[PDB]
DNA sequence: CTCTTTTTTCTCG
DNA sequence: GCGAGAAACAAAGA
């Protein structure tokens, strides 16, 4: 998932598990807890969920008085709230059991990660990750954004995917953002003029906030959290190869940029 | 059966 | 440090 999807999951979790006391924690794939599963099990069992936050694409469980469980869903991670008697599913790896139900984490590719740290280690953790600003008008400063773009020869799509210029963009929204801003994914950032950088800046914020509003892009997913999204119906280019651009009518093309599938309109996004 | 396709971080030169 | 390619891992399609 990307920022919008993670935020959707965050909101659902906040509304449903905050105030819940963890009865037990079990794992069929303990190796995904980078800080040690048995240690996390011992530390969190019996503690209560106080809140759920997010930074970039990272989900943050606030548990007990000073515990912070950092979860990254990577490519296919999915959470679901199920009954205590719910049958096990092939790719379920961890479960946080409460008195009236359980939170199950599943990940087909096993990329997702869990890390238990303390409240005062959160900010340092993200500084070490070098995560850029949240995609909001208040946090995403266009001036710094512009100076970083003017300094680099990197291609705009790969640079945006780094999470350093701004946090939250993944393959879907980076493609949607560049199409909206009329910028070709291979454009070297030092070649972007001020007006283009301004449109890009605003497009990043607008696209992601719209995606959040629509519950993210859900393309399937069972009863998993954040699976009722409607943003997928607003996608203009991602996965639209062969279809016609809604603005000019040209056929959306798909190429490979820095190893990633890339969808764009050759007319609207001049190289 | 082989090759390709679908977030983060490291290896290699 | 930087770009290119790939690995972690699983499944579905050509
Ligand atoms: Zn177009």
Tell me the CB-side half-sphere exposure of residue A108, using CA atoms within 13 A.
Answer: 3
Cβ–Cβ under 8 Å, residues A212 and A204:
no
Please indicate whether residue A68 is annotated as part of the active site: no
Breaks (C-N over 2.5 A) in chain A follow: none
* Coil/strand/helix, residue A122: helix
What determination technique applies here? X-ray
- Helix (H, G, I), strand (E, B), or coil: what is residue A199? helix
The whole-number Å distance from A162's CA to B3's C1' is 28
> How many CA atoms are closer than 13 Å to the CA of A196, on its beta-carbon side?
18
The one catalytic residue in A10, A54, A57, A68 is: A57
CA nearest to nucleotide C11 C1': residue: A108
The CA angle A62-A3-A75, to the nearest 5 degrees, is 95
Residues paired with A92 in a beta bridge = A106
d(CA A172, CA A163): 14
3-state secondary structure of A186: coil
Q: Is A80 annotated as a binding residue?
A: no
Query: A19 and A63 in contact (C-beta within 8 Å)?
Result: no
What tokens were used for A161? 């995917």
Any idea which residue has 């800080």 for tokens? A35
Count CB neighbours of A260 within 10 A: 15
- Neighbouring C-beta atoms of residue A87, cutoff 10 Å: 7
- What's the CA gap between A194 and A202, in Å, rounded? 12
Q: List Cβ neighbours of A238 (8 Å cut-off, separation of 6 or more).
A: A171, A172, A175, A176, A263
3-state secondary structure of A46: coil
Q: Please state, in angstroms and rounded to a whole number, the distance separating the CA atoms of residues A65 and A63.
A: 6
Q: Is the dihedral of CA A261, A265, A266, A271 positive or negative?
A: negative
Instruction: Determine the distance from the C-alpha atom of residue A21 to the mean position of all C-alpha atoms in its chain, rounded to a whole number.
Output: 27
Name the nucleotide with the smallest C1'–CA separation from A90.
Answer: C10
CB atoms within 10 A of CB A60: 19
Closest CA to A9 of A80, A108, A112, A68: A80
- Taking 3-state DSSP, the helix, strand and coil percentages for chain A, each rounded to the nearest 5, stand at 35, 25, 45
Q: Which of A18, A111, A109, A107 is nearest to A60 (CA)?
A: A18
Alpha helices in A26-181 (DSSP H): 37-44, 122-129, 142-151, 156-161, 171-180
Please provide the distance, in angstroms rounded to a whole number, between the alpha carbons at the two ends of chain A: 28
Ligand-binding site membership of A263 (annotated)? no
CA of A142 to C1' of C11 (A): 41
Contact, A199 vs A244, CB < 8 A?
A: no
DSSP, res A234: G
Neighbours of A55 (CB within 10 A): 19
Domains and CATH numbers, chain A: 1-132 (3.20.190.10), 133-271 (1.10.8.50)
Taking the CA of residue A170 and the C1' sugar atom of nucleotide B8, their distance in angstroms comes to 11
Q: In the β-sheet with A67-72, what is the strand arrangement from edge to edge? A: A49-55, A58-63, A67-72, A113-118
Distance between CA atoms of residues A7 and A109, nearest Å = 22
Give backbone dihedrals phi and psi of A61, rounded to 5 degrees, phi first. Answer: -90, 130
Nucleotide with C1' nearest the A158 CA = C3
Are the C-beta atoms of A211 and A231 separated by less than 8 Å?
yes
What is the resolution of the experimental data for this entry, in Å?
2.0
CA angle, A170 then A172 then A176, to 5°: 115
In this complex, the nucleotide whose C1' atom is nearest to the CA atom of residue A74 is: B7
CB atoms within 10 A of CB A105: 21
């Amino acid at each position: 998932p990307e920022l919008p999807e993670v935020e959707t999951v965050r909101r659902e979790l906040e509304k449903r598990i905050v105030g819940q006391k963890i009865i037990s924690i079990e794992a069929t794939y303990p190796r995904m807890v980078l800080t040690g599963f048995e240690q996390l099990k011992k530390e969190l069992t019996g503690k209560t969920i106080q809140g759920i936050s997010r930074r970039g694409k990272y989900l943050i469980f606030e548990i007990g008085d000073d515990f912070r469980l950092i979860s990254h869903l990577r490519m296919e991670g999915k959470y679901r709230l199920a009954t205590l008697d719910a049958p096990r599913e092939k790719h379920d790896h961890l479960t946080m059991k409460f008195a009236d139900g359980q939170l199950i984490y599943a990940d087909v590719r096993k990329f997702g990660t869990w890390e238990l740290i303390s409240t005062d280690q959160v900010l340092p953790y993200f500084l070490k990750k070098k995560i850029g600003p949240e995609p909001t008008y208040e946090d995403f400063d266009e001036k710094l954004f512009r100076e970083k773009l003017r300094k680099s020869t990197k291609k705009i799509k790969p640079y945006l995917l780094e999470q350093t210029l701004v946090a939250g963009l993944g393959n879907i929204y980076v493609d949607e953002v560049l199409w909206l801003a009329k910028i070709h994914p291979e454009k070297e950032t030092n070649q972007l003029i001020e007006s283009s950088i301004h449109l890009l800046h605003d497009s990043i914020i607008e696209i992601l906030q719209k995606a959040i509003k629509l519950g993210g892009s859900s393309i399937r997913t069972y009863s998993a959290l954040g699976s009722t999204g409607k943003m997928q119906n607003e996608l203009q280019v991602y996965g639209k190869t062969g279809e016609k651009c809604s603005r000019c009518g040209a056929e959306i093309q798909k190429i490979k940029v820095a190893g990633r599938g890339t969808h764009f309109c050759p007319v609207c996004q001049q190289k």
